[PDB]
């Protein structure tokens, strides 16, 4: 065994080795390994992406106008965000400006995705780490109604309702066909909710599973379908006609009325179900404000998102702020430049890829995707990994760094950047939230804090949906209907050689696509995705990524039941298909 | 009264078919899970992870040998000895073969499981291969699309449960009920196709009246699916209704049939 | 003035005359006049239909296959029931037998309309006679939550929900634009609910206004649209294809799944919202179990409905029983024959029509619709009526009688007939309802009882929806798909001269269409509709109809405010376009 | 902030247009009444009756003279001195004229108010007459259909409130947005019409595959409405989708154009 120091941690692979493969309640394929010491505390953590498809290789030779459709299929959970980054990148390369209504509709698509993705993660993916579903069978329905009514104005709170939910769960379990609840961690000592809170949370799990289907009807109106809506280089394909013959063939007042109805329902669900449940998880699990900090008190990154001035990606336009903090210095939020070769770079010395020199990092315009499965000695064989070798190559995920620093991305990172840049709405919301929990500001830099920030962002995004809809309606009242620019649709109008960057903030964090066009075709297409940052393996200096750092130093009650590992990983909302592409 | 056991596995994929399933409007996915089937293994939704998830997999396929339905999302890669997709330290294909051996029937959800989809597009770096080229001794129902329509997925499940039989299929293994006719043979813009009334550039006057998308590259004339009839997201829209031509996403090899914007 | 005796009443038109014109919260046009004595008790009541269109005239010379579409437009509230009676009548004339699935789907159409019609009447038409909307502003939201939870398992009951509903009402009235609430009867002494029951009821009025739109999606699947779905002579046009190519062009598994989802939601709303609200109205208004009896303890009529054996309209097939009671003898339920010329007859001595002899009644196969506007010696003039003359012709509604007896039809009539024939489900439901109220069985023969029976019937019909759906699915599982018989579609296949009767139970009561075909065309088409019975004018013996009888002997607190008159009239659910056609 | 006053009156009618309005899915009719307009008179829904209802009518048309929208459902009969339709003891036509004189604009809901509908079909016993043959000095927007589509009715209302103007109309006074194109020019069965693929008798093999209804009498080729695009009841269906040809119910005189089952 060996030991070394990095980022304030002591990385020590002595002691018992634990393997968690598969990680479930994520998108795609992940393996995690840890070592624990004689006090059952993690002293080493290893993050491994266990899939690869090769979209960067498949994109070569495609028409730039088609690229969005291919890269959308990087992921079905964050559906649409890669299409948005793609049309941004191709428009940046060729020199295309879209009409205002197209930009507003793209911002509606992105806010809709934030609302949907954050809600489904909270209940269906992370929820069962915090709610003991089987303990709900012990709850008193009248005390459940009293708890729910103390927390919210939400209508669905009667004692008879909670009895009916409880009885449905009882009938489901009684024959032994426990389905998704089989062989779970129920009864673990880290489940701290009282029975009434478990029954409230389970009822809400079911309500959210039903309601999430309605949110994406906004994507169906403007984008045809969800999952995987349609887009175009130059704007959007959903032509508008309010008051002329043939409005039945276009986005008309009836279609707009449908969108408004969904916005209102989405805000009400988030504000009166999700928000109070997040605060209740905080009230009953306060010690988790001190677990899983990782890189969140050291290095955090946002590119920024939601340009409110069409075709302007600068600081005065982006409604979601960008910036970087390193070395724990939150008093100096630094500007990010995605063209600068000294800023974003990816390393592969600990990943299953070939570079001519694996000791250096490559900016994405110099990127290489040459797969090389080479696990070394894994205590089995090349087709039987018993223990990954983290001294050598151990993942399908490349290692991104910013100025050589390992960064965390996502809701907590964005919240910290906006707070420290002085965004007034963010400061007031965060301060009020931590006051309600009787916790210090530093409590947000934790596994619990990731969950709280995600719920806060769902509320923010639901508010911005209404703002963007109102902006679209103002343009239509003023006779401004345009949804596409076609001046540069034809390849004969493009530069012979050009390159561009498309960037945004996906639900999970900072997203970039780097594209080079030559002779009418894609010459290079490189993606760096939020889970690529967070789930990163090590670099030539031995520096660890966000997941590995957040797991370090964690106590486990029962080594064979990895509930604490699952809680912290799921708090980042891992998307493994995204991370590897 | 016991519910039919279902094992749902995942190869190389983007998870769009699982997301489509949970959008079902009638029956709600909640009611499918609680009352119509026993969804006994599914990586995306299940409580157990790691060793606990491996125990569930082993237990269900042994206890219910010959009696469970296997749902497959995604596909196996043959490159790098299968280690482009790793499950419990071993190639995904090993888990696919063990699950298939005990199944009574297999549902291949989506273009990935049916044909290959985006990872199989040129130059197919991982040698991604559809389910029916690996599993050759079991009934396989293909439900293609990227992803298939939510209420098509749930209608196929309810048909199997209610009628206690597999749907009748075409020569490619697709259910006749939803894949027997082309998009273009039930398209509400066909009047405009027949009259030579076409969109020529985005947001032109023709686009603003809902004219036909053939000259913008629509692949509806060669694509079999239910999008122009059943439609998407509780009947709200479909690709052509919102102004983009069909990409051809239900058909084998659609990524490599030329640009989406070149004519059928 | 004059006085005479009929049916145990003293009809006296001396004293003060009150006029109510228009009657609101009904379908179509009605005028009511009464005389009251110096004790504020009604001693004379006059029912007048104030519209006519002439469908029986318009139908002459039409193709019998088209008739359903014309007669459907008799009414948009009871939409579909006239189309059903029409296809029945034409099939009876020509000798057509429909396939089992067509009969099952027709029974689904009829049960759907009972659910919809009864729900909307309870809240939107009759509700404000019982619920004091402005008094809801004085309720305590917590006390409202406690009341609702004591009465039902329905989920939507939180104190915050009731506060939000109350604040919506408060905002609505704050600008002085009271809309449908302007100049109402609020604060009248006959409003007896406490403030918390008014707020509960008002919340449910809004929930029902929203939910009713969902119920009719069943009509859209099988019939194309609602209002006014489509039908055919020979079955239904909604061809079925479950497992063959082209199922996307037909009623397939996805369409049937939509129907099942609506059935479950409809049952849940009726059983957990409408039923407890009807019982609550009863608990707070028990004196109304002794007001408005009218004909309901004397003479009641049902034709029967919902044939379960396809093409069999006999007693062993009809799920909703038929029969007649006269002379208050509920021990003698008599059989009804719609062909017998001595049973159903219509008189016009007090109506605006011409007969060769106005002192006798005509069976519908001998019916005449020859309009004659002749109001005679009114106070005022023929185009400016101050008082109708009920000693001569006073309505556009003909006067139907059964064996010369004046009858009541509708939910109370049906419930009494089924109870006294010994239908087990009816006996159990009625007994449990009246036990909950601590009222005798005779309490159902009243204005309150008409409301209670309507709620009972909505629950009955929602149960039958599931039964019929399950019957359809059983046939499909057995490979029985047929929905139309076409061997007698072409006119050359019909008898040169034939006649038929189509009958059913509409939401408001007994419905019949009598048709004669000659030489391929309609020769005669006569309709007798439920509100024709109930709103009937007098006959040559001076016998009064159901509305006029139910209003007799009623006390009024305030003569100028007709609340007691409106309560009793609305309890019958008047449909004036139906009554006159 | 005050809402626009609306007076809704009823002549000879079946009340289908009122029922259609309350079916609206987006915005809900509840929200139209509470938040979008001030529905100040309506016989079907109002609390007040008799003398109290007459006082509402008088007070509103006086206080808001020149400022209210008049909605009309049904039509006036000219026969029997107008006493085929009586309100407050006088001919309905007198209430129509008084209401119209104070209105800023008039909406004629349905085929009854627009053209005549079933009571005006041969031999028109009551001499039922459409609104625009009696009121000749006010803007009249015709919204035809028996009844019009629920979400078309609510979209026209939201347009007028949001944009503060009347919809643009064709030469017959119909809103271009929903009545500019024919049913047959946006019908999903048009592929079958163009191929000569027709239903010939009810429930034949063609009917079970969704073939064209032209030979069964469909009047879609001559009918302007939104049924084949917007569809009915929150997009669930329309007449043709459920297997019956269009009757022509949005067009003047549709009852007297021959049998519904005779070809167009
Ligand atoms: S839009 Fe596409 S599917 Fe529709 S008619 Fe045109 S080519 Fe055919
Ligand atoms: S069904 Fe009617 S509207 Fe549709 S294509 Fe055939 S004739 Fe035209
Ligand atoms: N959110 C999201 Fe998916 C990831 N990681 C992307 O981009
Ligand atoms: N119900 C109803 Fe209408 C009436 N009366 C009919 O028939
Ligand atoms: Fe639903 S996993 Fe998404 S890529 Fe095309 S079907 Fe595959
Ligand atoms: Fe809506 S009232 Fe119904 S009949 Fe044809 S529009 Fe008239
Ligand atoms: S792109 Fe796919 S979703 Fe339907 S319309 Fe074409 S088959
Ligand atoms: S009958 Fe009427 S409802 Fe539409 S489809 Fe034809 S215009
Ligand atoms: Cl799997
Ligand atoms: Cl493919
Ligand atoms: Cl009126
Ligand atoms: Cl007409
Ligand atoms: Mg990359
Ligand atoms: Mg009659
Ligand atoms: Ni993803
Ligand atoms: Ni009626």
Torsional class of B66: left (φ above 0), alpha (ψ -120 to 50), beta (otherwise): left
Contact A182 B47 (CB under 8 A): yes
What is the radius of gyration, based on Cα positions, of chain D?
20
Best CA proximity match to C232, nearest among C65, C64, C63:
C65
Is residue D69 within 8 Å of residue D5, measured between CB atoms? yes
How many residues in total does chain A contain?
581
Identify each DSSP E strand in C150-217 by its residue range.
none
- DSSP structure class, residue B36: I
DSSP-assigned letter for residue D2: P
Alpha-carbon span C565 to A365, nearest angstrom? 84
Question: Token pair for residue C169?
Answer: 């009402």
Rg (CA), chain B: 20
Q: Structurally, how many domains does chain C consist of?
A: 1
Q: Where are the beta strands (DSSP E) in A279-428?
A: 300-302, 305-307, 318-320, 323-325, 344-347, 399-402
What is the helix (H) or strand (E) element at residue C107, kind and residue range? Answer: helix C100-120
Nearest of A555, A561, A547 to residue A38 by alpha carbon: A555
Nearest residue in chain A measured CA to CA from C161:
A155
- How far is Cα of residue C273 from the mean position of the Cα atoms in its chain? 21
Closest atom, ligand 4, to C-alpha of C532: 5
Rounded CA-CA distance B175/B152 in Å is: 10
Q: Can you say which residues of B are annotated as belonging to the binding site for [3Fe-4S] cluster? A: 227, 246, 249
Cα dihedral across residues A262, A263, A266, A271: positive or negative:
negative
The domain that holds C415 is classified in CATH as: 1.10.645.10
Three-class SS of residue A358?
coil
Per the structure block, which two tokens stand in for D23?
A: 């079916």
Say which residues have a Cβ less than 8 Å from residue D86's Cβ, sequence separation at least 6.
C21, C29, C31, C50, C51, C385, D92
Beta pairing class for C300-302 and C323-325: antiparallel
Domain ranges within chain D, ordered by starting residue: 1-178, 179-264
Q: Which of C246, C261, C473 lies closest to B181 in CB terms?
A: C246
Q: In chain B, which residues have their Cβ closer than 8 Å to the Cβ of A351?
A: none
**The Cα angle at residue D34 between residues C29 and D58, in degrees rounded to 5:** 45
Assess contact for B154 and B26: CB atoms under 8 A: yes
Instruction: State phi, psi for D218 to the nearest 5 degrees.
Output: -50, 125
C297 secondary structure, DSSP code: G
Only one residue has tokens 């009822």, namely A203
Handedness of CA C97, C99, C104, C110 (dihedral sign): negative
The burial class, CB within 10 Å (0-12 / 13-18 / 19+), for C327 is exposed
Q: Which domain holds residue C89?
A: 1-581
Length of chain C: 581
Closest alpha carbon to D170 in D182, D162, D179 = D179
Q: Say how many C-beta atoms besides its own lie within 10 A of residue B148's C-beta.
A: 27
Tokens matching residue C322: 């038929």
Under 8 Å CB-to-CB from C97, ≥6 apart: which residues? Answer: C91, C310, C311, C485
Query: Which positions ≥6 away from C385 have C-beta within 8 Å?
Result: C375, C378, C379, D86, D89, D90
Q: Which two tokens stand for residue A107?
A: 């911002």
Beta-bridge partners for B69: B6, B105
Calculate Rg over the CA atoms of chain C. 24
Contact C313, C321 (CB under 8 A): no
Instruction: Tell me the C-alpha distance between C228 and C218, whole Å.
Output: 13
Closest alpha carbon to C197 in C120, C254, C125, C282? C282
Strand D86-87 versus strand D140-143 pairing type: unpaired
Breaks (C-N over 2.5 A) in chain C follow: none
- Facing residue for B177 by CB, picked from C242, C258, C261: C242
Question: Chains contacting A with at least 3 CB pairs below 8 Å?
Answer: B, C, D
Helix/strand/coil for D234: coil
Q: Is D112 annotated as a binding residue?
A: yes
Q: How far apart are CA C444 and CA A366, in angstroms?
A: 86
Query: Residue A4, SS3?
Result: strand
8 Å CB contact between C291 and C554: yes
State the DSSP string of C119-164.
HHIIIIISGGGTS-TGGGGG--HHHHHHHHHHH---SB--HHHHHH
Q: What are phi and psi of B93, to 5 degrees?
A: -55, -30
Rounded Cα–Cα distance for residues D51 and D216 (Å):
51
- Rounded Cα distance between D199 and D204, Å, is 7
Judged by DSSP in three states, C431 sits in helix
Choose among C76, C179, C181: nearest Cβ to D19. C76
Structure tokens at C278: 């009807």
d(CA C64, CA C488): 12
H helical segments located in A159-226: 159-174, 195-215, 217-223
Query: What number of other Cβ atoms are within 10 A of residue C343's Cβ?
Result: 17
Please list, residue by residue across D142-157, b when 16 or more beta carbons sit within 10 angstroms of its beta carbon and e when fewer do. Answer: bbbbbbbbbbbbbbbb
Contact D48, C184 (CB under 8 A): yes
Return the closest-CA partner of residue A62 out of A526, A523, A527, A528. Answer: A523
Question: In CATH, which superfamily holds the domain spanning B179-264?
Answer: Cytochrome-c3 hydrogenase, C-terminal domain (4.10.480.10)
Torsion angle of the four alpha carbons C63, C68, C69, C72, in this order, in degrees rounded to the nearest 10: 150
Q: Do B210 and A246 touch (CB under 8 A)?
A: yes
Assigned token pair, B68: 């469970």
Nearby residues of D204 by Cβ (< 8 Å), 6 or more positions away: none
Sheet holding C16-20, edge to edge: C16-20, C30-36, C42-49
What would the two tokens of residue A207 be?
A: 């309500």
Q: Which residues contact A292 (CB under 8 A, 6 or more apart)?
A: A446, A447, A448, A450, A550, A551, A554, A567, A568, A571
Closest-lying ligand to the alpha carbon of C506? Answer: 4
Q: How far apart (Å, rounded) are the C-alpha atoms in residues C512 and C503?
A: 4
The tokens of C62 are what?
A: 């039409």
Q: How far is the CA of A574 from the centre of ligand 10 (A)?
A: 27
The dihedral built from the CA positions of residue A240, A242, A246 and A251, taken in this order, carries a sign that is: positive
Determine how many CB atoms are found less than 10 A away from the CB of residue D99. Answer: 22
Query: What span, in angstroms and rounded, lies between the C-alpha atoms of A122 and C14?
Result: 75
- Which pair of tokens denotes residue C288? 């109304």
CA atoms within 13 A on the CB side of A180: 21
Q: Indicate the top mutation candidate among A54, A71, A73 to test ligand 5's pocket, ranked by most ligand atoms within 8 A of CB.
A: A73
Contact B18, B73 (CB under 8 A): yes
Distance of CA A93 to the CA centre of its chain: 26
How far is the CA of C564 from the CAs of B88, C130, C297, C408, C568, in angstroms? Answer: 77, 10, 20, 19, 6
Strand pairing of B103-109 and B68-73? parallel
Query: CA of B123: how far to CAs of A54, A56, A580, C473, in Å?
Result: 9, 11, 17, 49
SS3 C339: coil
With contact defined as beta carbons under 8 Å apart, do B52 and B96 qualify?
A: no
* Three-state DSSP state, C17: strand
Tokens of D239: 């007449």
Do the beta carbons of residue C227 and residue C185 sit within 8 Å?
A: no
Q: Which residue has the tokens 């029967």?
A: C304
Listed residue (A281, A288, A280, A277) closest to A443, CA to CA? A288
Distance between CA A565 and CA A552 in Å, rounded? Answer: 10
- CA-based Rg of chain A, rounded to a whole angstrom? 24
Please give the full DSSP string across C259-287, using - where no structure is assigned.
HHHHHHHHHHHIIIIIHHHHHHHHHH-GG
**Residue A349: partners with Cβ closer than 8 Å, 6 or more residues away:** A358, A359, A393, A399, A538, A539, A540
- Looking at 3.40.50.700, 3.30.465.10, 3.30.160.270, 1.10.10.10, the CATH number of the domain B1-178 comes to 3.40.50.700
Whether residue B191 and residue D188 make contact (CB cut-off 8 A), yes or no, is no
Count of Cβ atoms closer than 10 Å to residue B13 Cβ? 31
C148, C197 contact by CB (below 8 A): no
Kindly tell me the burial class for residue A105, based on how many C-beta atoms sit within 10 Å of its own C-beta (0-12, 13-18, 19 or more).
buried
Q: Angle, nearest 10°, between helix axes C275-284 and C141-151?
A: 110
Which atom in ligand 2 lies closest to the alpha carbon of residue B191? Answer: 5
DSSP state, residue B209: G
In DSSP terms, C513 is beta-bridged to C502, C527
- Determine the distance in angstroms separating the CA of D187 from the nearest CA of chain B, rounded to an integer: 5
Cβ of B112 below 6 Å from ligand 5:
yes
**What DSSP line would sit under A42-62, residue for residue?**
EEEEEEEE-B---HHHHTTT-
Which residues have C-beta within 8 Å of that of residue C328, sequence separation ≥ 6?
A: C297, C298, C299
* Resolution for this experimental structure (Å): 1.2
d(CA D192, CA B228): 14
Q: Is B246 on the interface with C (CB under 8 A)?
A: no
Burial of C8 (0-12, 13-18, 19+ CB in 10 A): exposed
Give the closest ligand to the alpha carbon of residue B130. Answer: 10
- Contact assessment for residue D60 and residue D41, using Cβ atoms and an 8 Å cutoff: yes
Distances (CA, A) of A46 to A11, A376, A380, B67, C249: 11, 16, 18, 38, 54
What does the alpha-carbon distance between residue A146 and residue A144 come to, in Å, rounded to a whole number?
5
> Reduced to 3 states, what is the DSSP secondary structure of residue C537?
coil
């Amino acid at each position: 065994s060996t030991q070394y120091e990095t980022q304030g941690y002591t990385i020590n692979n002595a002691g018992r080795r634990l393997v968690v493969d598969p990680i479930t309640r994520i998108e795609g394929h992940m393996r995690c390994e840890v070592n624990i010491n004689d006090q059952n505390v993690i002293t080493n953590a290893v993050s491994c992406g266990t899939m690869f498809r090769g979209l960067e290789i498949i994109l070569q030779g495609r028409d730039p106008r088609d690229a969005w459709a291919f890269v959308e299929r990087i992921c079905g959970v964050c559906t649409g965000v890669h299409a948005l980054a793609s049309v941004y990148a191709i428009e940046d390369a060729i020199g295309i400006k879209v009409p205002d209504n197209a930009n507003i509709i793209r911002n509606i698509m992105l806010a809709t995705l934030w609302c949907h993705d954050h809600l489904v993660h909270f209940y269906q993916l992370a929820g069962m780490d915090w709610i003991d579903v089987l303990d709900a069978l012990k709850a008193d329905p009248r005390k459940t109604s009293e708890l729910a009514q103390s927390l919210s104005s939400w209508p669905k709170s009667s004692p008879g309702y909670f009895f009916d939910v409880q009885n449905r769960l009882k009938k489901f379990v009684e024959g032994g066909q426990l389905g998704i609840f089989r062989n779970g961690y129920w009864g673990h000592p880290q489940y701290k909710l009282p029975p009434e809170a478990n029954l409230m949370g389970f009822a809400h799990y079911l309500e959210a599973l039903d309601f999430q289907r309605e949110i994406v009807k906004i994507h169906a109106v403007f984008g045809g379908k969800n999952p995987h809506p349609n887009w175009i280089v130059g704007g959007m394909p959903c032509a508008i006609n309010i008051d002329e013959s043939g409005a039945v063939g276009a986005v008309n007042m009836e279609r707009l009325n449908l969108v408004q109805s969904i916005i209102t329902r989405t805000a009400d669900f988030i504000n009166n179900v999700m928000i109070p449940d997040a605060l209740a998880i905080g009230q009953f699990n306060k010690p988790w404000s001190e677990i899983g900090t990782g890189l969140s008190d050291k290095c955090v990154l946002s590119y920024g998102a939601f340009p409110d001035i069409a075709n302007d990606f600068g600081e005065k336009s982006l409604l979601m702020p960008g910036g970087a903090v390193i070395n724990g210095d939150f008093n100096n939020v630094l500007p990010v430049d995605l063209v600068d070769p000294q800023q974003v770079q990816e390393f592969v010395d600990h990943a299953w890829y070939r570079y001519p020199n694996d000791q250096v990092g490559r900016h994405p315009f110099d990127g290489i995707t040459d797969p090389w499965y080479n696990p070394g000695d894994v205590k089995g064989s090349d087709t039987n990994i018993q223990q990954l070798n983290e001294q050598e190559r151990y993942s399908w995920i490349k290692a991104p760094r910013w100025r050589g620093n390992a960064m965390e991305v996502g809701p907590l990172a964005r919240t910290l950047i906006a707070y420290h840049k002085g965004d007034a709405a963010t400061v007031e919301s965060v301060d009020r939230m931590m006051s309600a929990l009787n916790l210090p500001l530093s409590g947000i830099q934790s596994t619990l804090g990731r969950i709280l920030c995600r719920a806060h962002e769902a509320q923010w995004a639901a508010g911005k949906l209404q703002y963007f809809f109102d902006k679209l309606m103002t343009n239509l009242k003023n006779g401004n209907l345009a949804t596409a620019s076609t001046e540069k649709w034809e390849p004969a109008t493009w530069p012979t050689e050009c390159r561009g960057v498309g960037f945004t903030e996906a639900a999970r964090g900072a997203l970039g696509h780097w594209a080079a066009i030559r002779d009418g075709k894609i010459d290079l297409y490189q993606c760096v995705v939020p889970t690529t940052w967070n789930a990163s393996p090590r670099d030539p200096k031995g520096q660890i990524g966000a997941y590995e750092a957040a797991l370090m130093n964690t106590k486990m009650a029962i080594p064979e039941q990895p509930l604490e590992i699952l809680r912290t990983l799921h708090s980042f909302d891992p998307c493994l298909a995204c991370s590897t592409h | 009264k016991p519910r039919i056991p279902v094992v749902w596995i995942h190869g190389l994929e983007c998870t769009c078919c699982t997301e489509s399933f949970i959008r079902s409007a009638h029956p709600l996915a909640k009611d499918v899970i609680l009352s119509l089937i026993s969804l006994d293994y599914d990586d995306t939704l299940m409580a157990a992870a790691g060793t606990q998830a491996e125990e569930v997999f082993e237990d269900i396929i042994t206890q219910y040998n010959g009696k469970y339905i296997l749902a497959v999302e995604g596909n196996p890669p043959l490159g790098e000895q299968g280690m482009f997709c790793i499950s419990s330290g071993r190639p995904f294909i090993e888990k696919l073969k063990r699950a298939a051996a005990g199944a009574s029937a297999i549902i291949a959800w989506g273009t990935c499981a049916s044909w290959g989809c985006v990872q199989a597009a040129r130059p197919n770096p991982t040698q991604a291969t559809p389910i029916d080229k690996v599993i050759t001794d079991k009934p396989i129902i293909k439900v293609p699309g990227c992803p298939p329509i939510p209420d098509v997925m749930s209608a196929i499940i309810t048909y199997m449960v209610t009628f206690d039989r597999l749907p009748d299929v075409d020569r490619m293994g697709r259910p006749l009920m939803f894949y027997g006719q082309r998009i273009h043979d039930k398209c509400y813009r066909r009047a405009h196709f027949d009259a030579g009334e076409f969109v020529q550039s985005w947001d032109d006057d023709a686009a603003r009246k809902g004219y036909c998308l053939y000259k913008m590259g629509c692949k509806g004339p060669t694509t079999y699916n239910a999008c122009s009839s059943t439609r998407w997201n509780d009947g709200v829209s479909f690709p052509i209704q919102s102004g983009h031509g069909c990409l051809g996403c239900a058909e084998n090899g659609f990524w490599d049939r030329g640009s989406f914007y070149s004519r059928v």
